[PDB]
Amino acid sequence: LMAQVFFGPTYYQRLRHMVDDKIHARARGPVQVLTRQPVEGRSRDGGLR
Amino acid sequence: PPQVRPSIAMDETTQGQDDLTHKLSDILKANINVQKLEMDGSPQHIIN
DNA sequence: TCTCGTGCCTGGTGTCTTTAATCC
DNA sequence: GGATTACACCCAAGACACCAGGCACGAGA
RNA sequence: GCCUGGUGUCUUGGGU
């Protein structure tokens, strides 16, 4: 490489936010009894607002 | 109709009623007691 | 065998006094 | 001297009526 | 032998 590269150890920390805890998709699914609109929340197969 | 005030099941075999359902029961009970006054013991200050 | 006491279930019904800026 | 106004979306974990009266059952005399 | 329902109201802690 025409340029030299700053290189060395650094302490790195692994944070709790991982993609497979966030990814979500909904085709059809459960609805609320009251509004017959899609439910809220990843944990309930919900839809985006 | 019940679509406006659906029942929900808190822990599967136990169901509570919507706030409107409880409140309509209170209006309905209170309505019967107005009928219960005008035919007998009304000390006027009780009617109010 | 009878009576009394305690516990559980069902039904009905409340109350000692004790966060800040704007307009209309 | 009054209320109404106060970004958006999303995730997740953590909770639930009280008191009084009546009836039934069990224990003790 | 097809249909197939699992809660709410808050509060708190977080993400951009």
UniProtKB/TrEMBL annotation, chain A:
Cell location: Nucleus
Per the record, the similarity remark reads: Belongs to the RNA polymerase beta chain family.
Q: Which organism is it from?
A: Komagataella phaffii (strain GS115 / ATCC 20864) (Yeast)
What is this protein's function?
DNA-dependent RNA polymerase catalyzes the transcription of DNA into RNA using the four ribonucleoside triphosphates as substrates.
Covered range of the whole protein: 1081 to 1129 of 1227
Tell me where the transmembrane regions lie: none
**Subunit record text:** Component of the RNA polymerase II (Pol II) complex consisting of 12 subunits.
Query: Any idea what this protein is called?
Result: DNA-directed RNA polymerase subunit beta
UniProtKB/TrEMBL annotation, chain B:
Signal sequence interval, chain numbering: none
Q: Where in the cell is it found?
A: Nucleus
| Family the entry assigns | Belongs to the RNA polymerase beta' chain family.
- Free-text function comment from the UniProt entry: DNA-dependent RNA polymerase catalyzes the transcription of DNA into RNA using the four ribonucleoside triphosphates as substrates.
Q: What is this protein called?
A: DNA-directed RNA polymerase subunit
What organism, scientifically named, is this protein from?
Answer: Komagataella phaffii (strain GS115 / ATCC 20864) (Yeast)
Task: Show the taxonomic lineage.
Answer: Eukaryota, Fungi, Dikarya, Ascomycota, Saccharomycotina
Question: What fragment of the whole protein does this chain represent?
Answer: 244 to 291 of 1743
